[PDB]
Design a binder for this molecule. Sequence first.
Ligand SMILES: O=C(O)c1cc(=O)[nH]c(=O)n1[C@@H]1O[C@H](COP(=O)(O)O)[C@@H](O)[C@H]1O
Ligand SMILES: O=C(O)c1cc(=O)[nH]c(=O)n1[C@@H]1O[C@H](COP(=O)(O)O)[C@@H](O)[C@H]1O
Lengths: 255, 257
Amino acid sequence: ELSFGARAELPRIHPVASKLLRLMQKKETNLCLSADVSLARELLQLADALGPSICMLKTHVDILNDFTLDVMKELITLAKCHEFLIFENRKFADIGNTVKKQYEGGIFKIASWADLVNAHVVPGSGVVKGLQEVGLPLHRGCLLIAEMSSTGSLATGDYTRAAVRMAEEHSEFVVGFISGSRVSMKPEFLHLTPGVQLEAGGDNLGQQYNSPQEVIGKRGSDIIIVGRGIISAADRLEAAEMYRKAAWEAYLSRL
Amino acid sequence: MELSFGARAELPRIHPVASKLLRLMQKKETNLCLSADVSLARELLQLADALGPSICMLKTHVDILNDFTLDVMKELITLAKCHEFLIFENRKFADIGNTVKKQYEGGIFKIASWADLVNAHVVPGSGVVKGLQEVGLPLHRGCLLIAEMSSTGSLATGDYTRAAVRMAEEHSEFVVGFISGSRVSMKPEFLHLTPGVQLEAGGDNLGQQYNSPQEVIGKRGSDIIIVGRGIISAADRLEAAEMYRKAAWEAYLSRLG
Ligand SMILES: O=C(O)c1cc(=O)[nH]c(=O)n1[C@@H]1O[C@H](COP(=O)(O)O)[C@@H](O)[C@H]1O
Ligand SMILES: O=C(O)c1cc(=O)[nH]c(=O)n1[C@@H]1O[C@H](COP(=O)(O)O)[C@@H](O)[C@H]1O
């Protein structure tokens, strides 16, 4: 088991992964905030106030009612100031020819501002080869969805193994996984885990929660992704700190 | 028994959106869905106007449309009503239920406001359908589940495809069919829509694989062909659409008997 700082220096490490691992060690946070808010002002307010506490901010551009590329310019400034990466939520999950345009184009131009994107592996490896065409020139990274947190997920067994092989064979662009646990034994890959709350439970639409201790400590993942656990709290600053402190200590303990 | 689209439109358990589709298919003799992955609204609208009479559906790619406004979608709706086709947005809904409802309803695009049909990947489990349904049900919208894919290395096989079929059958108030390479359900109320179709053999350099209208409709038992590059790359996109329409329509007539 290597520290985040050491992993950032691995020969085969991807630049985006290195930058992330560095800032994680520096700031003592392996917490990614999921900010699914409908107003640009809310997104920017949250990112400024919680920026110190997070390694990464998961955006949801598809639901921002007043998206503009200027908002993203401003977000990037915050990102650079507080030191966190930007991970857009959009689930790329089409054939390679189509995902390329989805990633680069349209009103959102996701590749022009997102350090990280995620893709589903269901279409086969063409999904990654397509993204890569746009992502590599722009010096970007990609996470593959190897497992999901929701009830009835089909991202199990051979599907998960297929995800891991895909990542390992496209390591110039793929830097990690969305998963519920460690799924790759190569320490160059990041594991990011959604479906995280301090308390037991779920939501009324299939979400299932596990704690930071369970996911980071017992299941060997690297980063927790938390949305409602923080956003719905009365004091969001305090919430983000509780989740950061939880995940960080689980990591240290594993070391 | 094989039934005509017109007959299927009258099936007891048929969804209103499926029935509207099936009836215009029969009336217009077309089971062709144009995939218009273009970056400009003028091209989209010009294609929708010129090919409108030849298609039963238009697959939009709003994420790629550089000059999207809701007013463009307003004009598309006009053309869809005039020429009689449904609007099917390509966006792959593939998140947990709570998240997909906002993606469908909201943001700048407000996809549920103008799309007759959406598609979802089934990998998140049935939550993905429940979330979409909370928005789309009152709007008489329908959902297609992605049961199989046309690309090399597709994981939508075996138990995965079966899970897709079961999910649709258990949510038939909202799920109206499949994206698939063949008939995957025996229930005639469900539509089968097949991408990866060109008149000529081949593929692309990023994993796409093609089969002909004759194969997919006639031998594999699908209902509708989805075609992008086969039409969009032609000099004459109207001529090309007519060729695909006649191919798919005759293939359907063949298995009808
Ligand atoms: O991409 C993800 O992180 C995602 C996949 C998954 O398997 N589970 C999952 O919860 N998500 C997303 O992670 C976030 C979890 O948010 P909360 O449940 O509010 O903490 C939401 O944006 C989900 O859409
Ligand atoms: O969502 C789809 O229809 C999709 C699934 C699939 O398995 N295969 C597939 O080709 N598609 C889409 O269908 C269209 C095919 O385009 P052409 O390959 O240009 O005919 C594109 O919009 C693809 O993204």
